[PDB]
């Protein structure tokens, strides 16, 4: 094929082939001349050489081309690929109808939705647009449909509405760790060029917002859509395929907010008020006439699936904080109080999620997980946790323990120089005194800080 500008491009095989034919024709001529044995053999040598270099160069003297510095690529090389077969395997199968750009958070979105940028979908879903434009008769033909897509008037949005409704879309990230590196979602159009990902599943993708990009594929047929929505949908795969434990587990804001809410205090606003129900508690808190963390007696009815998933109402007095009562409101009637009754950390939250799945089932845990996300965000925001210079507390006896450790290591180095101690003994002594001193500093800061 000719390159632009007058230039030509040719395979190395063509030049090798050409030389092959040339030498063969010369051999034909040489035969017609009745050439001596020595020269006929040399020509047969050259022929054998050329042929075998042509098939697979590399078992000979490495017969490159004229002046082009790189060794010529033989027939074998064209097939034999790294890694794996050239055309069938990596790299790498390019596919149409795909896009790639940066992911962005988007707190208000629900578990099964995603922000899908405007201009991408405009380009991608072109034929769906054209088809429905012409079938509904909003546009006379596909050519006029093309001019009308390229202007981008009100008409485009209705067709966009109809395709994006029943389309499910796939999000992909290059480190395909497991099958959940691609999940199916319902796309929701948003302004901008940034993809919105649901926060909870960021942990599964191991994604962070520092310029990472994700890929977005379009299942085109109805069957693909079905397979995506049924088998590949995010909401269907909450459980890790590896172990039974959760994959879509809390990331960070959630636990922090919950901690603010779940944490108990000696005394705050409205210590020792006795409430006949949770909603009054929450009403009191929202007015700032009560703190979220305060030990309190609340009248709450736990419900139990003792029957075939029915409600087994037990109705009396619980002693908890305000915060756990409010969260327990959100909590569906099938969870035992016991679960929220405790400290609630990452441990407890994950076990809670797990137990919720096993006893309650799929949908309560799904919806409740969404709930937990929003609540955690809310109370995290109201907590107002920050990081000041005084927040990193130098433990009271720091320099004492440091100077003691310093004087003792200096004493043990000088008594090393004295020659009652091998290298092993010295190593043991140094490492153990440092370990014990460091653990002392650790445990003293933890003691000092925890109950202050």
């Amino acid at each position: 094929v000719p390159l632009d500008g007058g230039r030509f491009a040719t395979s190395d095989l063509n030049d090798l082939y050409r030389r092959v034919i040339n030498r063969n024709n010369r051999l034909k001529r040489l035969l017609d001349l009745a050439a001596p044995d020595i020269i006929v053999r040399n020509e047969k040598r050259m022929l054998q050489e050329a042929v075998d270099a042509l098939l697979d160069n590399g078992r000979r003297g490495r017969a490159i081309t004229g002046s082009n510095k790189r060794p010529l690529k033989s027939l074998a090389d064209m097939i034999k690929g790294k890694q794996g077969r050239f055309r069938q395997n990596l790299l790498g199968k390019r596919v149409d109808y795909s896009g790639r750009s940066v992911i962005t958070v988007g707190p208000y979105l629900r578990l099964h939705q995603c922000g899908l940028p405007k201009k991408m979908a405009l380009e991608l879903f072109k034929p769906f647009i054209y088809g429905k434009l012409e079938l509904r008769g909003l546009a006379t033909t596909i050519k006029a449909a093309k001019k009308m897509v390229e202007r981008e008037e009100a008409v485009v949005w209705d067709i966009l509405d109809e395709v994006i409704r029943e389309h499910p879309v796939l999000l992909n990230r290059a480190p395909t760790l497991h099958r959940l590196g691609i999940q199916a979602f319902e796309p929701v159009l948003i302004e901008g060029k940034a993809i919105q990902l649901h926060p909870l599943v960021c942990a599964a993708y191991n994604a962070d917002f520092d310029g990472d990009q994700m890929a977005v594929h379009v299942p085109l047929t109805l069957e693909a859509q079905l397979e995506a929505r049924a088998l590949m949908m995010s909401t269907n795969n909450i459980l890790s395929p590896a172990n039974g434990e959760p994959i879509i587990v809390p990331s960070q804001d959630v636990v922090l907010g919950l901690y603010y809410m779940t944490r108990d205090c000696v005394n705050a606003k409205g210590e020792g008020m006795v409430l006949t129900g949770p909603k009054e508690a929450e009403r009191l808190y929202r007015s700032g006439l009560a703190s979220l963390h305060a030990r309190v007696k609340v009248r709450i009815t736990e419900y139990e699936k003792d029957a075939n998933g029915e409600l087994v109402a037990k109705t009396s007095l619980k002693d908890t904080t305000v915060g756990r009562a409010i969260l327990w409101m959100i909590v569906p009637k099938g969870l035992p109080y016991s679960i929220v009754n405790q400290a609630l950390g990452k441990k407890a939250i994950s076990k809670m999620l797990n137990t919720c799945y096993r006893i309650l089932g799929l949908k309560p845990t799904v919806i409740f997980a969404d709930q937990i996300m929003y609540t955690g965000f809310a109370y995290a925001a109201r907590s107002g946790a920050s990081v000041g210079i005084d927040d990193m507390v130098i433990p009271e006896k720091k320099h004492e323990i440091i100077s003691e450790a310093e004087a003792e290591v200096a004493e043990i180095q000088e008594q090393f120089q004295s020659g009652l101690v091998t290298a092993g003994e010295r190593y043991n002594k140094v490492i153990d005194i440092w370990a014990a001193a460091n653990d002392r500093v650790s445990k003293a800061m933890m003691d000092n800080l925890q109950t202050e």
């Binding site: 020595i38 040399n42 040598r45 050259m46 050489e49 000979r60 003297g61």
Partner: peptide, 14 residues
């Protein structure tokens, strides 16, 4: 002793 010298130049020269 022949050390796999594939070069037809050398053989022919010989």
């Amino acid at each position: 002793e022949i050390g796999r010298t594939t070069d037809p130049v050398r053989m022919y020269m010989r």
